[PDB]
Amino acid sequence: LYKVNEYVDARDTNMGAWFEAQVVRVTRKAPSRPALEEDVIYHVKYDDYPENGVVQMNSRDVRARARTIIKWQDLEVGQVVMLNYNPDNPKERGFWYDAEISRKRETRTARELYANVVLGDDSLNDCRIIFVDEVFKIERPGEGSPMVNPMRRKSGPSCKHCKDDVNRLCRVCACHLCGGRQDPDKQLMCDECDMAFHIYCLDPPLSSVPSEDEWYCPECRN
């Protein structure tokens, strides 16, 4: 079983995407049915989604962090791998999915990869994969070696300006005024420009979050 502090991937069952995570605790629950193995529950924190906090996860939704990249030339059809895709904008970078390679081709213009991409619901067949050099071998149970040297991956939603670095201020990511990431619960989101504002950084400030439908910032006439 995966150890405490072990860097791992964790699968968001709503969307099928895999996410860098770190094991915080391991709870071993006893089986409901005879001849069934004990149920390992992993409590995990997300590397770049700490806001979610520690989450309970089933051992099927957790596997050893992805370490090895398979090279273009080494990819063959039928292979199941983890690769990047964006269901909102396939040209642009997105999230990390498990997919079965369906078509591989090399034109004079560029190298093309297609795979069936597993999402929350089901597959998505013969998708045009564009990050062709960032195709990860899925770490198989049993084989490998604990990752206690994190192999980070470039993920879709990053900020161009602060690179999501939590030790930098940013007036894009975070509060538009101070650029601070603290008390995000007390940061109103403009319903027009989608900018964030601490309640206390507003002038005049607010003591708590308004209970109305929409909220606009000053610039957006409020």
Binding site: D12, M15, A17, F19, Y49, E51, N52, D88, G94, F95, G156, P157, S158, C159, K160, V172, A174, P184, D185, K186, Q187, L188, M189, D191, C193, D194, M195, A196, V209, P210, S211, E212, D213, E214, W215
Partner: peptide
Amino acid sequence: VRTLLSVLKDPIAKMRRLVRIEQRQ
């Protein structure tokens, strides 16, 4: 009313925000 925390939780919404922000004008 919507908060940054509620966004930062939803990985899609998080990403969708960034685009709305960067490609606006």
